């Protein structure tokens, strides 16, 4: 009307929240909630909980993480988390705003419908739209080609804190049969980097071992073209590549400092050699993407190959997409080379065009797309109203007519 819609992307690690129209969510808080320990409790202890950073070390409170691997585990706690998102942070009179909420891709009918209730009956929202990340990341990436083309057909690598998925999409909907996931995600890299630091560095206060590992990871690592040549650079040159970071000890308030080096290129490498930190998985991401695309229908593979869009925070290491495109046009033609060396008439078909995109709007993918969708006029036309929620019933939030 004349006050825009609220937009919330709830992830395993981080909830992004803010108003539609904006370029980036007003807040980015940890997706945890701190409550009491001794839980039959009376009084108004239910109203006793803190959120985000101010609860990542709360003295007398238990920190709880209600979202596991993308999917909601605890609806009571997700119910309260929403209470403060709306009233503390957004300060939205929830009755005056349509809302856009996101869902994992494979969140079944008895899941997304569960989150629609406890919204339409607690917060009295006049409208609700539960969106999907498969299409919002694709939409966020159109800010690069545009003069090229604008379609919703492509392979999406969503990599966050919990889970790394490979999601093929064809003109709107998601084939939910060729999706593959990878046990390598943000937290696993942080953990592996933290490991390398304990083996080598001292002076890091045990309390801040993850903190430091995250900062090394988030602030420095970058994928390399070849491993040995990089270790060679570091042993040959050394000083020109080992940077030094000094942090503050939280208890003593004096500095501590460590060398940074072998955990710059090795951390992100586990995407391409998961066996480095994973006993139960060995298949490099390049192969997983190739495999997914060949499992998809013939006549959609070439489109999927030339529009491999990156989404999420763990896709942000520098030149991660350039390494991704090499892999694919290593493997892929290799495969077709055989189709030449194994045939005559059928030997020659068409050099498969592979293109990994790398736009500036990466960590803000799902939310951004959601913000742009909620800005448009047609969003209000495809939203489910409270009047319909009451008169038709909660079934309506089971689906959303594939717009275009």
């Amino acid at each position: 009307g004349r006050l825009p819609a609220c937009v919330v992307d709830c992830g395993t690690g981080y909830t992004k929240l803010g108003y539609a129209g904006n370029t980036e969510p007003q807040f980015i808080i940890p997706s945890c909630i701190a409550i009491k320990e001794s839980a039959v409790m009376k009084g108004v202890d239910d109203l006793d909980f803190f959120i985000g950073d101010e609860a990542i070390e709360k003295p007398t409170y238990a920190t709880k993480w209600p979202i596991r691997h993308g999917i909601v585990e605890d609806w009571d706690l997700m119910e309260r988390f929403m209470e403060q998102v709306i009233f503390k942070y957004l300060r939205a009179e929830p009755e005056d705003h349509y809302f856009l909420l996101t869902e994992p891709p494979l969140n079944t009918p008895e899941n997304r419908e569960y989150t629609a209730e406890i919204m339409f009956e607690s917060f009295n929202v006049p409208g609700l739209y539960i969106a999907v990340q498969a299409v919002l990341a694709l939409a966020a990436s159109w800010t690069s080609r545009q003069v090229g083309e604008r379609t919703l057909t492509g392979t999406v690598i969503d990599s966050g804190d919990g889970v790394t998925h490979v999601i093929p999409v064809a003109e709107g909907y998601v084939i939910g049969s060729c999706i593959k996931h990878i046990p390598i995600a943000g937290r696993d890299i942080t953990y592996f980097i933290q490991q390398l630091l304990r083996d080598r560095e001292v002076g890091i206060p045990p309390e801040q071992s993850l903190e430091t590992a995250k900062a090394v990871k988030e602030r420095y690592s970058y994928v390399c073209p070849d491993l040995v040549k990089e270790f060679n650079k570091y042993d040959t040159d050394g000083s020109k590549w080992i940077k030094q970071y000094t942090g503050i000890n939280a208890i003593s308030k004096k500095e501590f400092s460590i060398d940074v080096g072998y955990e710059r290129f090795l951390g992100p490498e586990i995407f391409f050699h998961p066996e480095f930190a994973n006993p139960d998985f060995t298949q490099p991401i390049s192969e997983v993407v190739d495999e997914v695309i060949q499992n998809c229908p013939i006549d959609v593979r070439r489109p999927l190959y030339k529009n491999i869009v990156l989404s999420g925070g763990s896709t942000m290491f520098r030149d991660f997409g350039r390494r991704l495109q090499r892999d694919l046009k290593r493997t892929v033609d290799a495969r077709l080379k055989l189709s030449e060396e194994l045939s005559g008439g059928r030997l020659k078909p068409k050099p498969i065009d592979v293109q990994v995109i790398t736009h500036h709007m990466q960590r803000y993918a799902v939310w951004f797309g959601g913000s742009m969708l909620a800005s448009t006029p047609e969003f209000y036309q495809v939203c489910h109203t409270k009047k319909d929620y009451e008169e038709i019933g909660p079934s309506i939030c089971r689906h959303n007519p594939v717009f275009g």
């Binding site: 159109w142 800010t143 448009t376 047609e378 275009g404």
Partner: peptide, 24 residues
Amino acid sequence: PTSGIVGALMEVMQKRSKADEWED
């Protein structure tokens, strides 16, 4: 409907965009 998203993103770039050891 899709237009809304397209035509919109086109207006953003009109302003938002204003601001070899690797392989063969």
